[PDB]
Structure 1
Amino acid sequence: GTILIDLSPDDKEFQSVEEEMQSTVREHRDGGHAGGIFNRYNILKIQKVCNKKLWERYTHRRKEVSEENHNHANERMLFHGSPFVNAIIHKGFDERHAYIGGMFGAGIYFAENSSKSNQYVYGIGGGTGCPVHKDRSCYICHRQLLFCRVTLGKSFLQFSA
């Protein structure tokens, strides 16, 4: 039941999403090993992901969290990179999208920095890079990221390297 609706580059919604993408690029401590060397993106397309069932499943849980946290969902918009973005948009997030070896336990990871999520588009550590060229810094191949609505509720603060 997922449909993808293309946003026009002239739409304010396209423009605010592109700006969040571009402005949250940073340098990474791997010198670009996992995600490639770049300071900015060429945005090719932004699509709205519309799935009534998955939306209702999200808002249902959002309300449960909210009611457990003084009517505060603590909702953010965050990036997610994954080889399984195509499954996510059709079936939603679940346990199979979890990063088992992540630094904060087995769960589903999101980033404020778009360039951090970019490191995971081809797998953990960038895997072996693009399917076509086996290049983690491929400048030709089209990559996909998700920009997601995420309910944090009461979040456990872990200070970390």
Structure 2
Amino acid sequence: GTILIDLSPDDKEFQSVEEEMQSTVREHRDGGHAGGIFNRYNILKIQKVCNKKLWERYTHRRKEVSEENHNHANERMLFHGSPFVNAIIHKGFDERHAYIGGMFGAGIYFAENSSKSNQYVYGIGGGTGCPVHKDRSCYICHRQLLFCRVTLGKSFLQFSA
């Protein structure tokens, strides 16, 4: 039931999503090993992801969290980069999309920094890079990120390096 609608570059919604993408790039402590060396992106397309069933699954759960947290979902817009982006947009997020080995346990991980999610597009640690050239810093091959609505509710704060 998923359909993808292209946004026009003229649309304010395209433009605000582009700005969040571009303005949250940072340098990484790996010198670009995982994700490549870059200060900015060439945005080729932005599509709106529409699935009624998946949306209702999200809002149902959001209302539950909200009612457990003084009517505050603590909703954010955050990036996610994954080899499984195509399954995610058709079937939703589930246990198969979790980072089993992540620093905060097996769950599904999101970032404020678009460049952090970019490090996972080709797998954990950047995997072997693009399928075509085996290059984690490929400047040719087309990459995809998700910009996602995420319900945090009451969030456990972990200070960490």
1:102-159 CA-to-partner distances (Å, cap 9, x unmatched) read 0000000000000000000000000000000000000000000000000000000000
Q: What is the distance in 1 between the residues matched to 2:66 and 2:96?
A: 25
Give the secondary structure class of the aligned counterpart of 2:102: coil
1:39-98 CA-to-partner distances (Å, cap 9, x unmatched) read 000000000000000000000000000000000000000000000000000000000000
Cα deviation, residue 10, structure 1:
0.3
Give the secondary structure class of the aligned counterpart of 2:5: strand
Indicate the RMSD between aligned Cα atoms, in angstroms: 0.1
What is the TM-score of this pair, normalised by structure 2?
A: 1.00
Q: What is the distance in 2 between the residues matched to 1:146 and 1:7?
A: 15
* Moved segments of 4+, more than 3 Å: none
1:23-54 CA-to-partner distances (Å, cap 9, x unmatched) read 00000000000000000000000000000000
Aligned pairs for 1:130-149 (under 5 A) are 130-149=130-149
The runs of 5 or more residues in structure 1 that have no matched partner are none
Q: What is the distance in 2 between the residues matched to 1:122 and 1:87?
A: 15
What is the TM-score of this pair, normalised by structure 1?
A: 1.00
Q: What is the distance in 2 between the residues matched to 1:9 and 1:21?
A: 14
Q: What is the distance in 2 between the residues matched to 1:96 and 1:84?
A: 9
Give the secondary structure class of the aligned counterpart of 1:145: strand
Aligned residues: 161
Equivalent position of 1:114 in the other structure: 114
Q: What is the distance in 2 between the residues matched to 1:81 and 1:102?
A: 14
Q: What is the distance in 2 between the residues matched to 1:26 and 1:5?
A: 29
Q: What is the distance in 2 between the residues matched to 1:81 and 1:49?
A: 15
Give the secondary structure class of the aligned counterpart of 1:37: coil
The runs of 5 or more residues in structure 2 that have no matched partner are none
Give the secondary structure class of the aligned counterpart of 1:4: strand
Give the secondary structure class of the aligned counterpart of 1:22: helix
